[PDB]
Symmetry: D2
Subunit: 262 residues, 4 copies
């Protein structure tokens, strides 16, 4: 029954058991996948290793995507331990906290470059590094957010990065489709300051009147990584309780948001 029975996958971006990458990894494990994990540094190694064992994986590799010299060891590790890969989860996004404040206009060039390098270029370098180990039918998944194509408060440069990221998905889908490899983006809604407001705005205004769970994001990701979605590539797939369809605030005509004030 397992939709990834016997398929090998690399999970990049687990920070703890609430990480999107962990939800996806857990659903993939439940579908029979053979998993491997990366960790950013020694601090996150303390969280990734127990998670990896939780999910039956002894394959745990150091990868700081900002360090070019990490990629060639990763390749070697994967080749020695797994031999090949059937899927990659790329769940990596970072901007300086300050660039996530105020206005886009005040973004520094260094903050811009860091956001673009970590959030966008790392998908290129990761896929190019592992590109020879990918089996026929392999699937590469990255993560995105509605701020790529609409204005959302408190996104700023991350909105630029995610837009480029979704564009990269399209180009990579063409690059890798020649070899029957798929590339997709999962555009997730927020999962339970500014975050509490966006959570509540999504909860009040989404068609399903709820925030998505980590499990729902993980199951959608597993679907995109599995052969169930072998006809799907270059897709930006919204897992957001329907929020993306809303052109305005939801109403009952008074805004539901206003009813919530009593």
């Amino acid at each position: 029954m397992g939709f990834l029975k016997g398929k090998k996958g690399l999970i990049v971006g687990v920070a703890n058991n609430k990480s999107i990458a962990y939800g996806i990894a857990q659903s993939c494990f439940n579908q029979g996948a053979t998993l491997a994990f990366t960790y950013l540094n020694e601090s996150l190694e303390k969280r990734v290793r127990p998670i990896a064992q939780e999910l039956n994986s002894p394959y745990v590799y150091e990868l700081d995507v900002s360090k070019e010299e990490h990629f060639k060891p990763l390749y070697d590790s994967v080749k020695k331990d797994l031999g090949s890969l059937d899927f990659i989860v790329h769940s990596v996004a970072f901007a300086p906290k300050e660039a996530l404040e105020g206005s886009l206009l005040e973004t520094s060039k260094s903050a811009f470059n860091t956001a673009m390098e970590i959030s966008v270029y790392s998908l290129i370098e990761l896929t190019n590094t592992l590109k020879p180990l990918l089996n026929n039918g392999a699937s590469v998944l990255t993560l995105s957010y509605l701020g790529s194509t609409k204005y959302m408060a408190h996104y700023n440069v991350m909105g630029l990065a995610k837009a480029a990221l979704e564009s990269a998905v399209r180009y990579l889908a063409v690059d890798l489709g020649k070899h029957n490899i798929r590339v997709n983006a999962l555009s997730a809604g927020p999962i339970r300051a500014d975050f509490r407001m966006i959570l509540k705005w999504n909860e009040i205004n989404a068609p399903l009147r709820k925030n998505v769970s980590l499990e729902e994001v993980g199951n959608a990701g597993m679907y995109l990584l599995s052969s169930l979605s072998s006809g799907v590539s270059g897709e930006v797939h919204f897992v957001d309780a329907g929020y993306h369809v809303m052109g305005m605030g939801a109403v009952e005509a008074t805004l539901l948001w206003d009813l919530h004030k009593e």
Copy 2:
């Protein structure tokens, strides 16, 4: 015993084992669903019944969406035999043949109305009819095509219909989301079949997709069916109001595919000849 283990679904639009609705039904059956089927007419009934038997279904009902008289009995049947529904597949699209001939400019008002009624309004009437029987968490799926949002040849009024259909999906997602019911559209690429291989305009669209899609293939009925099953299952419980492309990536292409040949970006279509 998978994701639809024990979930009840109505499949509208099976004409034969090549129907998109049949691919979706088959994948749902493989995931444990309890299925029911409609038939447009007695000729198609001869065909819906063996498919139903193959997918373990004794629930087979007459539904011609053009006849309003058929909806209340369908409701009565479903309430009698199944009690409730956890998913609906709406695979219904029709325009008179002359409407996909020529240009949109030449479409008759009667042909326009028939296309809109059968391809769009029927989703409203089916969903409103069955709305009281839908359980918490239910999922409604319709079918669409890139012609809704881009120009596609020999599509004409259907491109208008599919656009309206996708808009309907959004509005229904808001209407039904209050009750934790999801509504989505699967936008399928063309599928190569024996019958389709007998028509020239279809042959071109299939060949164009195969040559220019990122995956350099046409999607299979199995691939469309599995994507549909995903959207109907609890795996996609976070997904609503979505237009989900199952088209080998074709939707991403802004121009013809090229291969660098003899240092020049030559079209892949030209190399084919």
Copy 3:
């Protein structure tokens, strides 16, 4: 009297001097256009005729798009009086979604969508090289908007028609576009809500004016936009870019401040 001299245009959908079609007609007149107008019925005639020759037009023709008998006399009239056309303005408006009857659905689709097909097909032989056809739409076509329902289906179909007609007519160097307007304040409870809401949350923190919609329409009808076809052009103070309500420090919605 610049970019639409000597250019002849038919304006469909004027009900009074606040109509979108009237704003567009006004801007075209200011650019030197020779205008003609349709009227729905004799009641509207009494209102269209004064507006017309306010814009120097004695060319006022009957058109209820729901009536096939009107379309050929219209062609004849235009050919008689104007000879040819350089632009057409199609500004025609009419209608839960689950509760929509087949009757209401068909009326909305016929009036809002099919009428562009019948009007353009009727007048196609009279359209000059470079002519421009403009219709009107709204964000409810592609996003959920409250109190829009079947009209959101219609406008979605309409924008799709714009694409297909752009291909049909571009063969003869004729352009087809849609202007997607934001709401305009005029002197109804839900409309008041969508209007303040747009005003509070739009990037420009204002509702668009009739003049702004009219000038954008003029641009699309003029040779200034001769490179533009099949376009849905948003004239909405930027509202279409918003993925959520606008904010002001500790995450406060601007909506909550007024």
Copy 4:
């Protein structure tokens, strides 16, 4: 009755008389605008200065967007010479030449960063530098291409850049709209030019556009310039955060154009 009479605008990105920035500048000049221009370096000043002089402009300033030290003098210049600005044209895009060939997968980190910096961040730095000089009602325009949102051959990292650029347009529209300042992007189709039809890849995309666009033509520099002028003028008062396609309709096509004849569909491309 010029659409920009008395309005002051800065034009960034003129290299020659075939530049998109020059076409936009020409249409603005015809509508009464007071123009100012930047030049990349001493070599490009030779071309920019005379173009500016033919459009009655003595306001010619050095700006290499990669050199941060140019921005503060630019502000000082505009402030001294013009006092304020009613519009800005940002027509600046560059990727290394290897990155625009082959695949996106082979892009170096340095090439990626250069493309993002020159094509995207430069709009942020220019707008942030000149913001205090922007008058009520001002309009900021940048340039884009369909490769931002669809795959286009031999565009690669620039497709990433332009996608980011269009997203920036939205965010800036929100940032600046609170001061009644508009921000838009013009998405241009390819223009046929002498030099540009000597490169085989450009000639192929140009002919593909010409054959398959609804209007069966390539857009001209004049058409792009007039659309830009409109977006910079008060005529587009109600338009902000928009990506406006000036491409002969090409963006609507979901496939190659075909004709019908004797019950047979043939791709128009194949008729040539």
